[PDB]
Amino acid sequence: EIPRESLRLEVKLGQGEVWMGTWNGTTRVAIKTLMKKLRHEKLVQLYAVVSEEPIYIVTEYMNKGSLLDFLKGETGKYLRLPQLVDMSAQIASGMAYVERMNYVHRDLRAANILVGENLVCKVAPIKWTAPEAALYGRFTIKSDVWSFGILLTELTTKGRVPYPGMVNREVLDQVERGYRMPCPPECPESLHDLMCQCWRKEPEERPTFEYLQAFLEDYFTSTEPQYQPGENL
């Protein structure tokens, strides 16, 4: 809870609205116009609120915008697998916290991850949604794991929409018949194997975020120690 005059609203980032600005003329902040329980290094941090109208919400500033906009921007073409797996390992870590706190995110995808400097990533759509959630409304941490498998394809394709060429109904139809996205060009099969574990039909058989985090943190020693950079990954 803070004074209204203590927030200088500078650049409008999107549409209520979202602004870049300064708090107490020193701290760069993100400002939402018309999360106290959750505290983790890989979750975007709430700084302050103004509870009465007009309502203002103040969070740490993530200077590269969404992961989605980062991968699709000027820097994305330079990202290679090591940086993309490192990003996914940070997302898995934030989701491991959510998982331990008995929460469920429900809209996990690159549009909803924010990126800072030093490639720091923090957690803040039928194609991203598990079949049991999309169809029967069973949203669990395991349906978030499914969304994470999909998010891994966004990372390995540097930000492409999943199920390229398919409309929502075709995706829902095909996935119901066992379809899964193939291995992305130049993505190691071991990483696609991980995707395929996240997309197991039985939700309880999908891995935990704690497991995902460990697999991705360790990836270039334990799983791909012979990794050589290619044309794009």
Side-chain angles (χ1 to χ4, degrees), residues 115-132:
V115 182
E117 277 311 326
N118 224 302
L119 294 163
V120 173
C121 286
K122 295 186 192 201
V123 183
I126 276 297
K127 287 179 177 195
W128 282 265
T129 298
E132 77 273 358

Side-chain angles (χ1 to χ4, degrees), residues 129-146:
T129 298
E132 77 273 358
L135 289 178
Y136 311 127
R138 327 195 213 282
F139 288 81
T140 63
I141 198 63
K142 294 307 189 186
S143 60
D144 291 336
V145 173
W146 178 289

Side-chain angles (χ1 to χ4, degrees), residues 56-133:
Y56 282 74
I57 300 153
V58 186
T59 58
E60 78 177 282
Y61 185 63
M62 299 298 289
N63 83 310
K64 287 308 197 184
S66 73
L67 225 188
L68 178 58
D69 293 340
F70 186 68
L71 299 165
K72 293 166 72 53
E74 201 173 55
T75 314
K77 72 174 119 166
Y78 297 102
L79 296 165
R80 290 133 277 143
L81 200 65
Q83 290 75 40
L84 296 165
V85 165
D86 187 82
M87 291 180 270
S88 75
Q90 297 175 64
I91 294 164
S93 172
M95 284 307 309
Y97 172 78
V98 174
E99 177 184 74
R100 285 188 300 277
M101 294 291 293
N102 299 317
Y103 288 86
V104 179
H105 185 108
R106 290 167 83 103
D107 195 16
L108 178 61
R109 56 188 165 110
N112 288 335
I113 304 300
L114 301 176
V115 182
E117 277 311 326
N118 224 302
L119 294 163
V120 173
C121 286
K122 295 186 192 201
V123 183
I126 276 297
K127 287 179 177 195
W128 282 265
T129 298
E132 77 273 358

Side-chain angles (χ1 to χ4, degrees), residues 150-209:
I150 306 298
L151 166 55
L152 286 165
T153 82
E154 291 186 273
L155 284 149
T156 48
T157 61
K158 305 185 191 163
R160 305 303 306 273
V161 177
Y163 308 100
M166 304 183 173
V167 286
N168 287 336
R169 209 97 222 168
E170 285 175 83
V171 170
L172 222 139
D173 292 358
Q174 281 292 298
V175 167
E176 280 298 297
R177 296 179 247 164
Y179 182 80
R180 300 297 188 262
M181 275 179 280
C183 189
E186 15 190 327
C187 177
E189 192 43 47
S190 58
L191 196 54
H192 182 245
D193 182 283
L194 199 80
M195 303 184 190
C196 286
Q197 302 172 205
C198 297
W199 302 331
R200 288 200 259 246
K201 182 201 191 91
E202 314 309 334
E204 79 272 8
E205 295 295 285
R206 313 168 187 154
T208 69
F209 281 112

